[PDB]
């Protein structure tokens, strides 16, 4: 039913209370909607601005029932929820966002297909679920090359970069451990990514492509607008827009994608959420993510995506938080998010900072300045 | 000089609409909020951590919110001289008493702001009914005459254009101390935003044009709509006021704007205000955020305007007009407060019309008819 609207004033129910789903929350918010969070863990990020709490595991199927009885419409913000979970919401629940979506993204090889029948180039890829299968996707595939676990990867755990033979013994390894595929190395000039917006009666917005940098396999740096040519831009957009349809988009899409010399683009993966590439949104865009995110399954009209100020964004993890904190009066120029977690690890992310300027390279000579990501500045020189 | 850091509390005395938008810009930052307010379950509460349900004039609650929190600032302001002492002396309240205390009474308030060299019209302290015939004397027809305290939204005001007005007139210097003030020919109502930290640094939002109806703000108009001089003039007048006043926090300076180029400061709001929300959506920084990061001594975010806007207002009166056209809202940024109750002229919240063009987002709230009677009222 692309009619169906879910008025301000109505409950939304968020599967998962890390940083996203609090961000979807604050931006839900100002609208006046009320949040109901499902989260194993007491006071998470979005539980400490939700108006209810349910802690409980992510399978529990009586926890996940009542989610559904006290909300109007039910989101997922948590990219490794058990699909079969989702599949009893919409089933017996409101979830326009559907189930077959995110199962095509969580994972690997089925996402790669999904991608191939939009029409779209990937990275060539096989199927490796054994050392023979490895040795011969090898052969097939040659150097360089990278083994990806098909499920449960995040910031490149789970991966080994076959740069020569060398690489192999690392290689099988992980192929043991997990089913993966292997896919030949892209040679990019820069990553982009694109988050796309449909809401459930079909309208789409698409925000401006970001440059991504990424470090440790994290990603450290989205520079918006992208230093690409506008014609990158405009193929981007429109693979976002392709993707959007063949994949039958209800709520927010962000497309990886890598940038060759000649001007070709390579579908990298897909999240079926807001993504951490979108986060420059809140402070230099007409509309953020999150709530473009809200009005998408609510079936508002959507915002304007304008982008009103040129950004860097910059991820805090736990391994910058005292630095952050140290330095914060020099943080002019400089527009801060911290999610409420409440304990540090070295690589966890813990907030971001959105760095505006009229100037994307003093956006960025502002961030090496801060010295807060001298770690990252060393890595990548 | 002192800094309260993210992770750390900020306590809020009101739970209104003003607390609301602030705990939500706090918790962007990674602050935790507490908040003080006399019924259960208001707009702030909704998005605090910790509520404290009880009076305003209630020292032992106001010592509790105190003590749970790093730092503490307010949305009501009639908050009396024994609570304000001590929280300035026991509690980090690091606005102060000293301007509250001055924007509290409309003649001390006048007061405070000729001292600090800006012009105001021509008023006098109306205590008795001798006074009133003196003043009425002196500053002539048309003249206003409104209560020193409690005025908000109109109430407690007689406009005198003519000696046929003298009786309503000394009916309200009957019930209330007063000033007299002469009628002041505007041609419009504009407000500046300033901001100014713990450490001094200031900001200052740009000039936005205030149509009112029925005394209650229906719209505000940013850029205003008045020439680049008028504004200048109104934004060094804002800068100097905080400066004079010594400003720590948010500072609402509303203004009439003659059509002959001259700026009278009308009243001044220690704290956001109603005409500002239109930073939410069209600033590069909102008066929320910038109110958290003055009293937390931050560094101030930017206040460029980033898009033209017309702010309008969604009163008890509007709220199912604007369900009902909820689908019409392109280009419109709706903020609902969650207020549990409804009352006809009750703020339950505000929509900001963003468009490249001021006369063209004018035109869409004309176009949604959800305001109609305040098109009609500013008609006749
Ligand atoms: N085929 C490839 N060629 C070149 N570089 C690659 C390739 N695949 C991955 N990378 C690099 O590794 C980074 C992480 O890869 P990928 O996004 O597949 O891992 P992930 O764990 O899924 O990351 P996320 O944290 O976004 O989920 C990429 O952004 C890119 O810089
Ligand atoms: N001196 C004056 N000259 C002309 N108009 C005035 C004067 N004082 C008040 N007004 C009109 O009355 C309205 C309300 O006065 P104000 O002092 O703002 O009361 P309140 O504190 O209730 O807002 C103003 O918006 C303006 O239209
Ligand atoms: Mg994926
Ligand atoms: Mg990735
Ligand atoms: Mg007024």
């Given at each position: 039913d692309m009619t169906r609207i879910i008025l301000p004033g109505k409950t939304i129910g968020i599967i998962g209370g890390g940083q996203l789903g609090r961000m979807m929350a604050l931006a839900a918010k100002e609208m006046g909607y009320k949040i109901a969070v499902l989260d194993p863990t007491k006071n998470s990020p979005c539980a400490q601005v939700a108006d209810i709490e349910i802690v409980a595991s992510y399978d529990d199927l009586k926890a996940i029932q009542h989610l559904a009885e006290i909300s109007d419409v039910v989101t997922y913000?948590?990219?490794?929820?058990?699909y079969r979970c989702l599949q009893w919401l919409e089933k017996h629940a409101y979830l326009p966002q559907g189930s077959q979506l995110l199962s095509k993204t969580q994972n690997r090889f089925t996402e790669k297909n999904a991608i191939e029948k939009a029409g779209l180039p990937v990275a060539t890829y096989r199927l490796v679920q054994n050392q023979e299968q490895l040795t011969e996707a090898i052969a097939e595939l040659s150097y360089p090359s990278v083994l990806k676990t098909t499920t449960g990867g995040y910031d490149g755990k789970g991966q080994v970069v076959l740069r020569?033979?060398?690489?192999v013994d690392e290689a099988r390894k992980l192929a043991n451990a997990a089913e993966c595929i292997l896919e030949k190395w892209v040679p990019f000039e820069k990553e982009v990514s694109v988050i796309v917006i449909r809401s459930v009666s079909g309208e789409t917005k698409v925000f401006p492509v970001a440059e991504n940098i990424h470090v440790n396999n994290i990603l450290h740096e989205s520079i918006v607008?992208?230093?690409?040519?506008e014609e990158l831009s405009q193929k981007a957009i429109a693979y976002a827009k392709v993707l959007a349809d063949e994949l039958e988009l209800v709520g927010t899409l962000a497309v990886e994608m890598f940038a060759t010399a000649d001007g070709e683009i390579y579908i990298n993966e897909l999240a079926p959420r807001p993504h951490?590439?979108?986060?420059?949104?809140?402070?230099?865009?007409?509309?953020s993510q999150f709530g473009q995110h809200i009005r998408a399954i609510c079936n508002l009209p959507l915002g304007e995506t304008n982008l009103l100020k040129p950004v860097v964004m910059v991820n805090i993890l736990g391994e910058h938080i005292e630095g952050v904190l140290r330095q914060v009066?020099?943080?002019?120029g400089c527009y801060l998010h911290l999610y409420g977690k409440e304990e540090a690890k070295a690589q966890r992310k813990m907030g971001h900072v959105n760095i505006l300027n009229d100037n994307i390279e003093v956006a960025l000579e502002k961030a090496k300045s801060l010295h807060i990501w001298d770690h990252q500045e060393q890595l990548l020189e």
């Open positions: 913000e948590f990219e490794n929820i058990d020569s033979e060398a690489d607008p992208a230093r690409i040519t951490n590439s979108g986060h420059y949104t809140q402070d230099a865009c007409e509309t009066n020099r943080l002019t």
